[PDB]
mmCIF file of N, CA and C in Angstrom:
data_model
loop_
_atom_site.group_PDB
_atom_site.id
_atom_site.type_symbol
_atom_site.label_atom_id
_atom_site.label_comp_id
_atom_site.label_asym_id
_atom_site.label_seq_id
_atom_site.Cartn_x
_atom_site.Cartn_y
_atom_site.Cartn_z
ATOM 1 N N UNK A 1 0.900 -1.352 -0.071
ATOM 2 C CA UNK A 1 0.044 0.002 -0.124
ATOM 3 C C UNK A 1 0.754 1.165 -0.027
ATOM 4 N N UNK A 2 0.349 2.281 0.534
ATOM 5 C CA UNK A 2 1.122 3.628 0.661
ATOM 6 C C UNK A 2 2.059 3.373 1.992
ATOM 7 N N UNK A 3 3.200 4.129 1.773
ATOM 8 C CA UNK A 3 4.353 4.145 2.764
ATOM 9 C C UNK A 3 4.489 5.592 3.284
ATOM 10 N N UNK A 4 4.604 5.749 4.575
ATOM 11 C CA UNK A 4 4.969 6.916 5.302
ATOM 12 C C UNK A 4 6.046 6.623 6.449
ATOM 13 N N UNK A 5 7.277 6.949 6.529
ATOM 14 C CA UNK A 5 8.304 6.591 7.581
ATOM 15 C C UNK A 5 8.760 7.833 8.195
ATOM 16 N N UNK A 6 8.680 8.023 9.323
ATOM 17 C CA UNK A 6 9.092 9.335 10.165
ATOM 18 C C UNK A 6 10.241 9.040 11.236
ATOM 19 N N UNK A 7 11.379 9.689 10.884
ATOM 20 C CA UNK A 7 12.548 9.241 11.959
ATOM 21 C C UNK A 7 12.815 10.486 12.875
ATOM 22 N N UNK B 1 -1.015 -4.211 3.439
ATOM 23 C CA UNK B 1 -1.926 -2.849 3.378
ATOM 24 C C UNK B 1 -1.017 -1.628 3.474
ATOM 25 N N UNK B 2 -1.594 -0.585 4.007
ATOM 26 C CA UNK B 2 -0.687 0.776 4.213
ATOM 27 C C UNK B 2 0.256 0.516 5.322
ATOM 28 N N UNK B 3 1.337 1.311 5.167
ATOM 29 C CA UNK B 3 2.445 1.205 6.326
ATOM 30 C C UNK B 3 2.690 2.753 6.809
ATOM 31 N N UNK B 4 2.757 2.739 8.067
ATOM 32 C CA UNK B 4 3.162 4.010 8.858
ATOM 33 C C UNK B 4 4.116 3.499 10.002
ATOM 34 N N UNK B 5 5.395 3.976 9.994
ATOM 35 C CA UNK B 5 6.305 3.581 11.133
ATOM 36 C C UNK B 5 6.819 5.126 11.568
ATOM 37 N N UNK B 6 6.822 5.153 12.901
ATOM 38 C CA UNK B 6 7.185 6.352 13.724
ATOM 39 C C UNK B 6 8.255 6.163 14.720
ATOM 40 N N UNK B 7 9.528 6.613 14.504
ATOM 41 C CA UNK B 7 10.547 6.305 15.286
ATOM 42 C C UNK B 7 10.898 7.462 16.363
ATOM 43 N N UNK C 1 0.709 14.141 16.275
ATOM 44 C CA UNK C 1 1.786 13.483 15.762
ATOM 45 C C UNK C 1 1.961 13.473 14.247
ATOM 46 N N UNK C 2 2.327 12.548 13.520
ATOM 47 C CA UNK C 2 2.294 12.293 12.101
ATOM 48 C C UNK C 2 0.874 11.670 11.626
ATOM 49 N N UNK C 3 0.635 12.173 10.388
ATOM 50 C CA UNK C 3 -0.830 11.838 9.783
ATOM 51 C C UNK C 3 -0.656 11.174 8.629
ATOM 52 N N UNK C 4 -1.441 9.891 8.451
ATOM 53 C CA UNK C 4 -1.376 9.202 7.133
ATOM 54 C C UNK C 4 -2.912 8.719 6.971
ATOM 55 N N UNK C 5 -3.741 9.198 5.951
ATOM 56 C CA UNK C 5 -5.122 8.846 5.756
ATOM 57 C C UNK C 5 -5.145 8.332 4.412
ATOM 58 N N UNK C 6 -5.755 7.125 4.263
ATOM 59 C CA UNK C 6 -5.866 6.280 3.091
ATOM 60 C C UNK C 6 -7.318 5.979 2.620
ATOM 61 N N UNK C 7 -7.783 6.693 1.408
ATOM 62 C CA UNK C 7 -9.082 6.469 1.072
ATOM 63 C C UNK C 7 -9.383 5.536 -0.125
ATOM 64 N N UNK D 1 -1.214 11.382 19.893
ATOM 65 C CA UNK D 1 -0.047 10.500 19.120
ATOM 66 C C UNK D 1 -0.081 10.531 17.703
ATOM 67 N N UNK D 2 0.436 9.567 17.084
ATOM 68 C CA UNK D 2 0.512 9.443 15.707
ATOM 69 C C UNK D 2 -1.071 8.938 15.160
ATOM 70 N N UNK D 3 -1.389 9.343 13.956
ATOM 71 C CA UNK D 3 -2.789 8.872 13.309
ATOM 72 C C UNK D 3 -2.579 8.341 12.111
ATOM 73 N N UNK D 4 -3.218 6.955 12.066
ATOM 74 C CA UNK D 4 -3.272 6.229 10.634
ATOM 75 C C UNK D 4 -4.760 5.903 10.411
ATOM 76 N N UNK D 5 -5.549 6.374 9.405
ATOM 77 C CA UNK D 5 -6.998 6.171 9.159
ATOM 78 C C UNK D 5 -7.027 5.329 7.792
ATOM 79 N N UNK D 6 -7.655 4.207 7.694
ATOM 80 C CA UNK D 6 -7.670 3.280 6.467
ATOM 81 C C UNK D 6 -9.161 2.900 6.164
ATOM 82 N N UNK D 7 -9.707 3.735 5.017
ATOM 83 C CA UNK D 7 -11.181 3.624 4.515
ATOM 84 C C UNK D 7 -11.287 2.579 3.524
ATOM 85 N N UNK E 1 -3.262 8.421 23.217
ATOM 86 C CA UNK E 1 -2.040 7.538 22.722
ATOM 87 C C UNK E 1 -2.051 7.660 21.175
ATOM 88 N N UNK E 2 -1.513 6.552 20.480
ATOM 89 C CA UNK E 2 -1.571 6.435 19.129
ATOM 90 C C UNK E 2 -2.976 6.000 18.639
ATOM 91 N N UNK E 3 -3.288 6.346 17.374
ATOM 92 C CA UNK E 3 -4.592 5.941 16.976
ATOM 93 C C UNK E 3 -4.581 5.219 15.542
ATOM 94 N N UNK E 4 -5.012 3.983 15.432
ATOM 95 C CA UNK E 4 -5.192 3.288 14.080
ATOM 96 C C UNK E 4 -6.637 2.978 13.912
ATOM 97 N N UNK E 5 -7.462 3.417 12.938
ATOM 98 C CA UNK E 5 -8.872 3.134 12.546
ATOM 99 C C UNK E 5 -8.815 2.438 11.250
ATOM 100 N N UNK E 6 -9.557 1.268 11.147
ATOM 101 C CA UNK E 6 -9.390 0.388 10.155
ATOM 102 C C UNK E 6 -11.173 0.156 9.735
ATOM 103 N N UNK E 7 -11.474 0.682 8.668
ATOM 104 C CA UNK E 7 -13.058 0.697 8.062
ATOM 105 C C UNK E 7 -13.319 -0.314 6.927
ATOM 106 N N UNK F 1 -5.089 5.492 26.666
ATOM 107 C CA UNK F 1 -3.856 4.614 26.136
ATOM 108 C C UNK F 1 -3.899 4.656 24.519
ATOM 109 N N UNK F 2 -3.418 3.670 24.038
ATOM 110 C CA UNK F 2 -3.517 3.670 22.719
ATOM 111 C C UNK F 2 -4.752 2.938 22.008
ATOM 112 N N UNK F 3 -5.176 3.561 20.823
ATOM 113 C CA UNK F 3 -6.469 3.139 20.302
ATOM 114 C C UNK F 3 -6.315 2.326 19.023
ATOM 115 N N UNK F 4 -7.058 1.208 18.933
ATOM 116 C CA UNK F 4 -7.046 0.522 17.642
ATOM 117 C C UNK F 4 -8.623 -0.095 17.397
ATOM 118 N N UNK F 5 -9.188 0.486 16.468
ATOM 119 C CA UNK F 5 -10.725 0.136 16.220
ATOM 120 C C UNK F 5 -10.846 -0.576 14.749
ATOM 121 N N UNK F 6 -11.380 -1.754 14.664
ATOM 122 C CA UNK F 6 -11.601 -2.474 13.576
ATOM 123 C C UNK F 6 -13.050 -2.680 13.040
ATOM 124 N N UNK F 7 -13.510 -2.209 12.029
ATOM 125 C CA UNK F 7 -14.852 -2.272 11.642
ATOM 126 C C UNK F 7 -15.250 -3.322 10.489
ATOM 127 N N UNK G 1 -7.009 2.607 30.362
ATOM 128 C CA UNK G 1 -5.840 1.774 29.680
ATOM 129 C C UNK G 1 -5.787 1.756 28.080
ATOM 130 N N UNK G 2 -5.342 0.687 27.514
ATOM 131 C CA UNK G 2 -5.276 0.692 26.130
ATOM 132 C C UNK G 2 -6.731 0.162 25.735
ATOM 133 N N UNK G 3 -7.181 0.543 24.324
ATOM 134 C CA UNK G 3 -8.346 0.254 23.786
ATOM 135 C C UNK G 3 -8.381 -0.557 22.364
ATOM 136 N N UNK G 4 -9.007 -1.743 22.273
ATOM 137 C CA UNK G 4 -9.075 -2.395 20.996
ATOM 138 C C UNK G 4 -10.614 -2.863 21.045
ATOM 139 N N UNK G 5 -11.257 -2.385 19.773
ATOM 140 C CA UNK G 5 -12.716 -2.725 19.604
ATOM 141 C C UNK G 5 -12.813 -3.388 18.210
ATOM 142 N N UNK G 6 -13.413 -4.678 18.005
ATOM 143 C CA UNK G 6 -13.477 -5.372 16.928
ATOM 144 C C UNK G 6 -14.966 -5.614 16.460
ATOM 145 N N UNK G 7 -15.437 -5.039 15.457
ATOM 146 C CA UNK G 7 -16.793 -5.203 14.965
ATOM 147 C C UNK G 7 -17.092 -6.311 14.038
ATOM 148 N N UNK H 1 -9.002 -0.406 33.657
ATOM 149 C CA UNK H 1 -7.769 -1.131 33.075
ATOM 150 C C UNK H 1 -7.754 -0.949 31.676
ATOM 151 N N UNK H 2 -7.246 -2.108 31.052
ATOM 152 C CA UNK H 2 -7.376 -2.308 29.546
ATOM 153 C C UNK H 2 -8.649 -2.836 29.110
ATOM 154 N N UNK H 3 -9.167 -2.305 27.922
ATOM 155 C CA UNK H 3 -10.335 -2.724 27.279
ATOM 156 C C UNK H 3 -10.199 -3.451 26.010
ATOM 157 N N UNK H 4 -10.773 -4.698 25.895
ATOM 158 C CA UNK H 4 -10.928 -5.314 24.607
ATOM 159 C C UNK H 4 -12.407 -5.798 24.504
ATOM 160 N N UNK H 5 -13.216 -5.352 23.414
ATOM 161 C CA UNK H 5 -14.636 -5.712 23.205
ATOM 162 C C UNK H 5 -14.702 -6.334 21.632
ATOM 163 N N UNK H 6 -15.262 -7.404 21.562
ATOM 164 C CA UNK H 6 -15.320 -8.187 20.509
ATOM 165 C C UNK H 6 -16.903 -8.509 20.041
ATOM 166 N N UNK H 7 -17.397 -7.964 19.011
ATOM 167 C CA UNK H 7 -18.831 -8.070 18.679
ATOM 168 C C UNK H 7 -18.915 -9.027 17.384
ATOM 169 N N UNK I 1 2.547 17.129 12.987
ATOM 170 C CA UNK I 1 3.678 16.296 12.223
ATOM 171 C C UNK I 1 3.656 16.389 10.671
ATOM 172 N N UNK I 2 4.214 15.310 10.186
ATOM 173 C CA UNK I 2 4.186 15.312 8.569
ATOM 174 C C UNK I 2 2.846 14.768 8.216
ATOM 175 N N UNK I 3 2.463 15.102 7.019
ATOM 176 C CA UNK I 3 1.064 14.676 6.428
ATOM 177 C C UNK I 3 1.228 13.895 5.112
ATOM 178 N N UNK I 4 0.662 12.774 5.028
ATOM 179 C CA UNK I 4 0.508 12.038 3.667
ATOM 180 C C UNK I 4 -1.078 11.751 3.438
ATOM 181 N N UNK I 5 -1.741 12.156 2.515
ATOM 182 C CA UNK I 5 -3.086 12.017 2.296
ATOM 183 C C UNK I 5 -3.296 11.271 0.851
ATOM 184 N N UNK I 6 -3.882 10.121 0.715
ATOM 185 C CA UNK I 6 -3.910 8.972 -0.612
ATOM 186 C C UNK I 6 -5.447 8.979 -0.987
ATOM 187 N N UNK I 7 -5.771 9.497 -1.835
ATOM 188 C CA UNK I 7 -7.184 9.405 -2.375
ATOM 189 C C UNK I 7 -7.394 8.336 -3.593
ATOM 190 N N UNK J 1 -4.906 -10.018 10.480
ATOM 191 C CA UNK J 1 -5.747 -8.764 10.505
ATOM 192 C C UNK J 1 -4.861 -7.270 10.562
ATOM 193 N N UNK J 2 -5.254 -6.402 11.028
ATOM 194 C CA UNK J 2 -4.529 -5.238 11.087
ATOM 195 C C UNK J 2 -3.622 -5.358 12.387
ATOM 196 N N UNK J 3 -2.533 -4.490 12.190
ATOM 197 C CA UNK J 3 -1.553 -4.617 13.251
ATOM 198 C C UNK J 3 -1.108 -3.098 13.833
ATOM 199 N N UNK J 4 -1.161 -2.977 15.225
ATOM 200 C CA UNK J 4 -0.638 -1.741 15.875
ATOM 201 C C UNK J 4 0.218 -2.267 16.912
ATOM 202 N N UNK J 5 1.568 -1.744 16.878
ATOM 203 C CA UNK J 5 2.527 -2.175 18.061
ATOM 204 C C UNK J 5 2.945 -0.711 18.610
ATOM 205 N N UNK J 6 2.861 -0.630 19.954
ATOM 206 C CA UNK J 6 3.363 0.588 20.630
ATOM 207 C C UNK J 6 4.334 0.292 21.608
ATOM 208 N N UNK J 7 5.644 0.754 21.493
ATOM 209 C CA UNK J 7 6.758 0.582 22.290
ATOM 210 C C UNK J 7 7.150 1.614 23.372
ATOM 211 N N UNK K 1 -6.749 -12.839 13.974
ATOM 212 C CA UNK K 1 -7.712 -11.619 13.870
ATOM 213 C C UNK K 1 -6.795 -10.422 13.860
ATOM 214 N N UNK K 2 -7.257 -9.187 14.497
ATOM 215 C CA UNK K 2 -6.485 -8.060 14.645
ATOM 216 C C UNK K 2 -5.724 -8.265 15.681
ATOM 217 N N UNK K 3 -4.443 -7.414 15.785
ATOM 218 C CA UNK K 3 -3.385 -7.380 16.793
ATOM 219 C C UNK K 3 -3.105 -5.966 17.194
ATOM 220 N N UNK K 4 -3.133 -6.029 18.673
ATOM 221 C CA UNK K 4 -2.615 -4.652 19.222
ATOM 222 C C UNK K 4 -1.558 -5.213 20.369
ATOM 223 N N UNK K 5 -0.410 -4.893 20.456
ATOM 224 C CA UNK K 5 0.550 -5.242 21.450
ATOM 225 C C UNK K 5 1.030 -3.765 22.112
ATOM 226 N N UNK K 6 1.108 -3.619 23.325
ATOM 227 C CA UNK K 6 1.336 -2.367 24.118
ATOM 228 C C UNK K 6 2.519 -2.592 25.205
ATOM 229 N N UNK K 7 3.628 -2.090 24.852
ATOM 230 C CA UNK K 7 4.895 -2.465 25.715
ATOM 231 C C UNK K 7 5.109 -1.316 26.849
ATOM 232 N N UNK L 1 -8.670 -15.880 17.490
ATOM 233 C CA UNK L 1 -9.492 -14.536 17.363
ATOM 234 C C UNK L 1 -8.789 -13.498 17.535
ATOM 235 N N UNK L 2 -9.261 -12.159 17.989
ATOM 236 C CA UNK L 2 -8.409 -10.960 18.065
ATOM 237 C C UNK L 2 -7.503 -11.207 19.278
ATOM 238 N N UNK L 3 -6.365 -10.440 19.269
ATOM 239 C CA UNK L 3 -5.259 -10.451 20.116
ATOM 240 C C UNK L 3 -4.901 -9.088 20.782
ATOM 241 N N UNK L 4 -5.020 -8.822 21.946
ATOM 242 C CA UNK L 4 -4.558 -7.712 22.662
ATOM 243 C C UNK L 4 -3.477 -8.040 23.937
ATOM 244 N N UNK L 5 -2.239 -7.498 24.045
ATOM 245 C CA UNK L 5 -1.263 -8.116 24.788
ATOM 246 C C UNK L 5 -0.749 -6.609 25.637
ATOM 247 N N UNK L 6 -0.863 -6.604 26.843
ATOM 248 C CA UNK L 6 -0.596 -5.235 27.527
ATOM 249 C C UNK L 6 0.458 -5.514 28.652
ATOM 250 N N UNK L 7 1.840 -5.071 28.390
ATOM 251 C CA UNK L 7 3.065 -5.359 29.263
ATOM 252 C C UNK L 7 3.317 -4.278 30.320
ATOM 253 N N UNK M 1 -10.558 -18.805 20.924
ATOM 254 C CA UNK M 1 -11.483 -17.441 20.801
ATOM 255 C C UNK M 1 -10.621 -16.345 20.974
ATOM 256 N N UNK M 2 -11.121 -15.106 21.442
ATOM 257 C CA UNK M 2 -10.352 -13.892 21.668
ATOM 258 C C UNK M 2 -9.309 -14.049 22.740
ATOM 259 N N UNK M 3 -8.180 -13.314 22.643
ATOM 260 C CA UNK M 3 -7.247 -13.303 23.605
ATOM 261 C C UNK M 3 -6.835 -11.847 24.193
ATOM 262 N N UNK M 4 -6.965 -11.752 25.541
ATOM 263 C CA UNK M 4 -6.471 -10.647 26.221
ATOM 264 C C UNK M 4 -5.425 -10.959 27.420
ATOM 265 N N UNK M 5 -4.071 -10.619 27.365
ATOM 266 C CA UNK M 5 -3.202 -10.915 28.419
ATOM 267 C C UNK M 5 -2.660 -9.701 29.036
ATOM 268 N N UNK M 6 -2.779 -9.431 30.371
ATOM 269 C CA UNK M 6 -2.539 -8.248 30.961
ATOM 270 C C UNK M 6 -1.285 -8.598 32.111
ATOM 271 N N UNK M 7 -0.064 -8.027 31.832
ATOM 272 C CA UNK M 7 1.146 -8.188 32.880
ATOM 273 C C UNK M 7 1.213 -7.128 33.686
ATOM 274 N N UNK N 1 -2.989 -7.063 6.970
ATOM 275 C CA UNK N 1 -3.945 -5.885 7.044
ATOM 276 C C UNK N 1 -3.009 -4.602 6.868
ATOM 277 N N UNK N 2 -3.321 -3.580 7.471
ATOM 278 C CA UNK N 2 -2.670 -2.132 7.755
ATOM 279 C C UNK N 2 -1.767 -2.326 8.912
ATOM 280 N N UNK N 3 -0.631 -1.627 8.652
ATOM 281 C CA UNK N 3 0.400 -1.746 9.776
ATOM 282 C C UNK N 3 0.714 -0.253 10.239
ATOM 283 N N UNK N 4 0.801 -0.188 11.648
ATOM 284 C CA UNK N 4 1.208 1.126 12.414
ATOM 285 C C UNK N 4 2.172 0.761 13.562
ATOM 286 N N UNK N 5 3.467 1.134 13.426
ATOM 287 C CA UNK N 5 4.394 0.748 14.436
ATOM 288 C C UNK N 5 4.936 1.996 15.072
ATOM 289 N N UNK N 6 4.888 2.174 16.527
ATOM 290 C CA UNK N 6 5.147 3.450 17.171
ATOM 291 C C UNK N 6 6.267 3.189 18.186
ATOM 292 N N UNK N 7 7.529 3.615 17.891
ATOM 293 C CA UNK N 7 8.717 3.461 18.773
ATOM 294 C C UNK N 7 8.984 4.418 19.844
ATOM 295 N N UNK O 1 4.469 20.115 9.328
ATOM 296 C CA UNK O 1 5.608 19.441 8.785
ATOM 297 C C UNK O 1 5.678 19.267 7.255
ATOM 298 N N UNK O 2 6.216 18.252 6.753
ATOM 299 C CA UNK O 2 6.018 18.183 5.246
ATOM 300 C C UNK O 2 4.911 17.660 4.672
ATOM 301 N N UNK O 3 4.307 17.964 3.546
ATOM 302 C CA UNK O 3 3.051 17.731 2.865
ATOM 303 C C UNK O 3 3.162 16.872 1.539
ATOM 304 N N UNK O 4 2.456 15.741 1.441
ATOM 305 C CA UNK O 4 2.502 15.099 0.087
ATOM 306 C C UNK O 4 0.965 14.645 0.099
ATOM 307 N N UNK O 5 0.147 15.127 -0.988
ATOM 308 C CA UNK O 5 -1.200 14.708 -1.166
ATOM 309 C C UNK O 5 -1.311 14.189 -2.679
ATOM 310 N N UNK O 6 -1.883 12.963 -2.749
ATOM 311 C CA UNK O 6 -1.950 12.222 -4.022
ATOM 312 C C UNK O 6 -3.467 11.789 -4.420
ATOM 313 N N UNK O 7 -4.045 12.508 -5.359
ATOM 314 C CA UNK O 7 -5.396 12.210 -5.920
ATOM 315 C C UNK O 7 -5.657 11.332 -6.823
ATOM 316 N N UNK P 1 6.269 22.935 5.856
ATOM 317 C CA UNK P 1 7.546 22.180 5.254
ATOM 318 C C UNK P 1 7.565 22.297 3.713
ATOM 319 N N UNK P 2 8.046 21.214 3.157
ATOM 320 C CA UNK P 2 7.951 21.144 1.579
ATOM 321 C C UNK P 2 6.660 20.575 1.290
ATOM 322 N N UNK P 3 6.054 21.055 -0.063
ATOM 323 C CA UNK P 3 4.987 20.483 -0.597
ATOM 324 C C UNK P 3 5.146 19.849 -1.855
ATOM 325 N N UNK P 4 4.473 18.686 -2.074
ATOM 326 C CA UNK P 4 4.182 17.896 -3.267
ATOM 327 C C UNK P 4 2.844 17.437 -3.399
ATOM 328 N N UNK P 5 2.132 17.991 -4.541
ATOM 329 C CA UNK P 5 0.595 17.629 -4.710
ATOM 330 C C UNK P 5 0.651 17.059 -6.097
ATOM 331 N N UNK P 6 0.017 15.703 -6.243
ATOM 332 C CA UNK P 6 -0.051 14.992 -7.450
ATOM 333 C C UNK P 6 -1.576 14.781 -7.785
ATOM 334 N N UNK P 7 -1.979 15.356 -9.018
ATOM 335 C CA UNK P 7 -3.542 15.255 -9.259
ATOM 336 C C UNK P 7 -3.646 14.169 -10.441
ATOM 337 N N UNK Q 1 2.718 1.650 -3.398
ATOM 338 C CA UNK Q 1 1.911 2.921 -3.381
ATOM 339 C C UNK Q 1 2.868 4.214 -3.346
ATOM 340 N N UNK Q 2 2.078 5.195 -2.855
ATOM 341 C CA UNK Q 2 3.027 6.445 -2.733
ATOM 342 C C UNK Q 2 4.024 6.452 -1.640
ATOM 343 N N UNK Q 3 5.055 7.055 -1.665
ATOM 344 C CA UNK Q 3 6.165 7.048 -0.701
ATOM 345 C C UNK Q 3 6.538 8.437 -0.193
ATOM 346 N N UNK Q 4 6.435 8.749 1.161
ATOM 347 C CA UNK Q 4 6.969 9.980 1.851
ATOM 348 C C UNK Q 4 7.732 9.499 3.087
ATOM 349 N N UNK Q 5 9.089 9.851 3.097
ATOM 350 C CA UNK Q 5 10.139 9.366 4.240
ATOM 351 C C UNK Q 5 10.704 10.816 4.670
ATOM 352 N N UNK Q 6 10.641 10.961 6.003
ATOM 353 C CA UNK Q 6 10.905 12.320 6.751
ATOM 354 C C UNK Q 6 12.030 11.859 7.735
ATOM 355 N N UNK Q 7 13.218 12.447 7.369
ATOM 356 C CA UNK Q 7 14.483 12.194 8.404
ATOM 357 C C UNK Q 7 14.750 13.218 9.321
ATOM 358 N N UNK R 1 4.665 4.687 -7.144
ATOM 359 C CA UNK R 1 3.772 5.758 -6.985
ATOM 360 C C UNK R 1 4.808 7.040 -6.981
ATOM 361 N N UNK R 2 4.260 8.101 -6.339
ATOM 362 C CA UNK R 2 4.972 9.453 -6.324
ATOM 363 C C UNK R 2 5.930 9.311 -5.092
ATOM 364 N N UNK R 3 7.087 10.012 -5.175
ATOM 365 C CA UNK R 3 8.100 9.924 -4.146
ATOM 366 C C UNK R 3 8.386 11.353 -3.602
ATOM 367 N N UNK R 4 8.408 11.573 -2.286
ATOM 368 C CA UNK R 4 8.795 12.975 -1.612
ATOM 369 C C UNK R 4 9.867 12.375 -0.518
ATOM 370 N N UNK R 5 11.085 12.847 -0.460
ATOM 371 C CA UNK R 5 12.103 12.391 0.521
ATOM 372 C C UNK R 5 12.598 13.782 1.319
ATOM 373 N N UNK R 6 12.437 13.865 2.523
ATOM 374 C CA UNK R 6 12.956 15.130 3.249
ATOM 375 C C UNK R 6 14.053 14.857 4.230
ATOM 376 N N UNK R 7 15.212 15.377 3.968
ATOM 377 C CA UNK R 7 16.375 14.962 4.919
ATOM 378 C C UNK R 7 16.610 16.176 5.907
#
């Protein structure tokens, strides 16, 4: 699906 | 499905 | 926090 | 906190 | 806290 | 606390 | 506390 | 305490 | 935080 | 099913 | 089924 | 069934 | 059935 | 299903 | 934060 | 922040 | 799907 | 899909 990664 | 990862 | 909305 | 909503 | 809602 | 709701 | 609701 | 409800 | 919306 | 993990 | 794990 | 584990 | 474990 | 992981 | 909107 | 909009 | 990564 | 990376 869609990807959002927050570091 | 959709992915959200929060570090 | 962070927001991801998938329609 | 963080929000992910999947419709 | 964190929120995940799946419809 | 944390929230997960599955419809 | 933490919440999980499954419909 | 913690809550889990299964319908 | 950061925003990603997918229609 | 859906996955939410809170550390 | 659905999974919620709270550490 | 559904799983909720609270540590 | 459904599982809830509280530590 | 959908994935949300919060560290 | 940063914004990405996908129609 | 930065903006990207995709129609 | 769509990708947004925030460092 | 579309890509936005923010360093």
